[PDB]
Design a binder for this molecule. Structure first.
Ligand code: HEM
Ligand code: HEM
Ligand code: HEM
Ligand code: HEM
Ligand SMILES: [Fe+3]
Ligand SMILES: [Fe+3]
Ligand SMILES: [Fe+3]
Ligand SMILES: [Fe+3]
Ligand SMILES: [Fe+3]
Ligand SMILES: [Fe+3]
Ligand SMILES: [Fe+3]
Ligand SMILES: [Fe+3]
Ligand SMILES: [Fe+3]
Ligand SMILES: [Fe+3]
Ligand SMILES: [Fe+3]
Ligand SMILES: [Fe+3]
Ligand SMILES: [Fe+3]
Ligand SMILES: [Fe+3]
Lengths: 159, 159, 159, 159, 159, 159, 159
């Protein structure tokens, strides 16, 4: 069996939006960790692993279609240097992915690959939550005030 | 606190060698996973998770010093279509790590960042041990026969 | 067996940087306790005991080398009278120790005492963490604002 | 057996400093409860019961001496209408008791009643802790700022 | 709250006698630990941990009063090369504590800090009991013989 | 992957040593057991067994470094004929080991063989500890006396 | 009680192929584990220890006969460079041992050391068990083929 070249591209293009996100997210939590937002550190680490889940899932698909999953390339990481920054820098990829995955899902249905369509419908819903979350952190950051908010991300005492 | 910019240079350099290997190693496994080489893929898979472990390990040391860890660059991946070829390409990476890290270790103690020295030293031991293993696979392929050796990386029944 | 007189001095000099730190740290936590930063109190107590670990370890070494461990002298304690103060007053010793232990480690290797070198390499890494921590508390104190931060060190309700 | 009339008075006078404190403390916690400082509510309730312990203990003594414990009278309750107020209103009795119990303890030794002296030495130490605490809450209230501090006395969410 | 500056004088004075003994006692143990006198070193070791316990105990009382506890001074240590000599030197310290503390106890009640009196009283009881023990070692050395007595502080086989 | 032939020489040189201890010690222990010093025997036995530990771990590096583990060589055995004697025989070895190994360590280090160093850095520490032990016996042998000490190496009752 | 030097000559001499066995078998199993014949390796190794127990039962009785165990005389090792020799080698010592013991059991029963008789009988039974094994290994090697036998000696996957 072989997979359709325009899917293969859309997959291997999500594969990278994954590889890309894995690093930022990971590194972002490790930084959250070093500044001392350990509570929050842990959760950014959580989302990070979630993306390695997605990559491994996309990878699984490509090989089934008999394509060559691309681990070699990467996206351009926005790397926030404050909490706020980082959330933005993250929403950054998240939306992109959505922007990339909407028409690609229908592209799939046209191409008649129901399995890869559902792979991507799921990533969408997953990511939408990541988004609603990230952007909520913001909604809340202004309601509370960076400062105050930030102590909601440390242990007692910190680290 | 603030580390020595060359040492950091060396550390953020290893962190690349590392992500290279994670990606490379992972892909080979999922690759052997495909060909039905399931027992083996679990092993290869495990090696990747170590290289992940290493990566965060270097990442930690970086932030403690102060440096900005590079989760943005990736070395050039070598992927072998066959098992034997796959073995070569990973030796390929490790032997490089030994080269990078030997002189590197000596310099670290020299510049008096002993802790970052001990770190790399450990790495070396693992890295050697991964090599011993991989070269030993290459002989068992010879001694046993590429086919017969291959019959030993599938389960019962296969995949 | 006998130990080399320049090591013996470096050991017995770290022995005191230990005895010294044991008191400040201890007293510092007991004060953190009395003001009411009990969460934090507990952790300063933690680091304190860690140093009595180091002293007892240095002491173990000296006797092996057949030297006379010096419990009689002490260092000059910087005793902070606010949280912030204290962290500084602590980083105070921590760096010193590092400053004292870098060339002493190589001194050891020259002298060819691998065991006492490793004793001190470990203290270094330990202390570097204490440092990264202490100085992080600072990084965070300014990001959060003494006040806010400080309630991150009490129980609910306080004491 | 009969007890010495000047002790009896000192006992039955502490008996009331007890009955008095039981109400304020209790009522004070119940108010802390209704405003919503439940964490803190619970602890004021704690000290309250501690005083009913003391009353019952004083009472035990008087009957042994064959006196008539006086449950009929009461002291004048300072009833705080803010957290701060209350702490003051409490330290209010606490010091009094100390002020009353120092010379009374020696009065006892003169009178040669070692048992009732020790009853009161204990109350002293108990109360000194209550004091150091209360007054610490203050020390901390200014360091933190009423507001901030106060949320250190609620549950998540409040009540 | 604020204690009586002379009493505090007395307390911060005991806290010195204490750190002296901790350091002295600990070192003797690790000292008997070396000579192979292992069973005995555990005992001596334990005595040190009590003196630590005492120290924090005095430290606590200090802060409650208000005084600044002296973790900066240390008395003059006497270290015996032999077991018997080692015994003398620790009697040396305790008998001093009895001298310091007797008159001290009387003054405390006098000045009407009964609680700090009770404290020292306790200390005395322990301090006497440590003395009883140490003098009794000195006789068993006599009765039994310094060698034979020494055979009773090693395990089986020795260290 | 091959290892530096000088190192492999030093590695092999420790190997024949360790094999000499495995044999020296083991016999001693048994002799000790046949003497009635069963308590002592056990201990010595645990030292020969741990000797064997190093032998294997040295064999490990050797094989990995691709040289040839020497199991034909075997230094000269001096087999003690008094308890005291055996002690002195075995200190003999532990010093030759320390005498060959302290210099031999830096060679490894300089010749960029980090792991081989750490290997021996550890054998060293053990040797120092076993040396310490053995001289601590002999000091104890003199303080107690031969009859006295020996008796601590018998079970009660003997054998 | 003293021993018959005819036997004491035998016993001590059996100790020799004994100690020589230990060494040969041990190194082999390390070579085998090292080549990747880990399943095979485990068994070889077990024989190594199975041999140390023979050295011990020998070393016990030698001492029981007021004899004098020899731990200096290592017999001439044969060292296989492939599984086929290794078997052959091992099978060599095992046979030598058989031809030296056959008579021995007669010299013993004659000169009247029955106990040593039954010791050496037992050693023999084992020696045959390991010979019956070493030759089946040689057959299965012919019957199945070398590559093929070799593949039942790796785990799955190979080490
Ligand atoms: C780039 C491609 C990567 C892929 C496909 C990948 C995949 C995975 C998978 C499948 C897991 C197991 C899922 C789980 O345990 O929940 C995992 C865990 C983990 N990942 Fe990754 N990962 C990647 C990169 C990274 C990076 C860049 C880091 C760190 C910077 C990292 C660090 C870790 C660690 C430390 C674990 C758990 C360790 C363990 O349980 O053994 N990985 N990853
Ligand atoms: C100055 C040299 C000192 C040394 C070498 C030393 C050593 C030790 C050691 C080895 C331990 C056990 C480790 C553990 O339990 O985790 C310990 C525990 C402890 N230390 Fe110290 N210490 C010293 C001074 C002090 C001081 C100044 C204080 C208080 C002001 C103190 C208070 C304590 C207490 C209360 C414990 C635990 C009590 C127990 O478990 O019995 N020590 N110390
Ligand atoms: C005025 C003289 C009083 C005395 C001598 C007294 C004595 C005691 C004693 C001995 C206890 C048991 C100790 C324990 O459970 O820990 C207790 C518990 C308690 N007290 Fe009082 N008390 C007094 C007044 C009050 C007042 C004014 C209140 C409330 C406004 C109160 C409410 C309670 C409650 C609700 C309990 C626990 C309920 C239970 O476990 O049955 N008491 N008291
Ligand atoms: C040369 C005379 C030796 C004697 C008499 C001896 C004695 C023994 C015996 C009786 C056992 C356990 C037997 C069993 O469980 O079946 C043992 C365990 C062991 N043998 Fe030996 N042994 C000798 C030499 C060696 C050598 C040459 C090596 C490797 C080079 C070695 C490595 C070990 C190890 C590593 C263990 C237990 C694992 C550990 O504690 O690390 N031994 N020894
Ligand atoms: Fe994703
Ligand atoms: Fe996400
Ligand atoms: Fe690596
Ligand atoms: Fe690796
Ligand atoms: Fe330290
Ligand atoms: Fe520290
Ligand atoms: Fe009361
Ligand atoms: Fe109270
Ligand atoms: Fe004391
Ligand atoms: Fe004491
Ligand atoms: Fe050794
Ligand atoms: Fe040793
Ligand atoms: Fe055998
Ligand atoms: Fe045998």
């Amino acid at each position: 069996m072989q997979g359709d070249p325009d899917v293969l591209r859309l997959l291997n293009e999500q594969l990278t939006s994954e590889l890309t996100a894995i690093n930022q997210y990971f590194l972002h939590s490790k930084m959250q960790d070093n500044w001392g937002f350990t509570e929050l550190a842990a959760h950014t680490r959580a989302e990070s692993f979630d993306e390695m889940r997605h990559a491994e899932e996309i990878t699984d698909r490509i090989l089934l279609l008999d394509g060559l999953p691309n681990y070699q390339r990467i996206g351009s990481l926005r790397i926030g240097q404050t909490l706020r920054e980082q959330f933005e820098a993250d929403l950054a990829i998240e939306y992109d992915v959505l922007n990339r995955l909407k028409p690609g899902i229908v592209m799939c249905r046209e191409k008649q690959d129901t399995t890869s369509a559902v792979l991507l419908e799921k990533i969408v819903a997953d990511e939408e939550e990541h988004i609603d979350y990230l952007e909520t952190q913001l909604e809340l950051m202004d309601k509370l005030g960076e400062e105050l908010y930030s102590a909601q991300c440390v242990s007692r005492p910190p680290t």
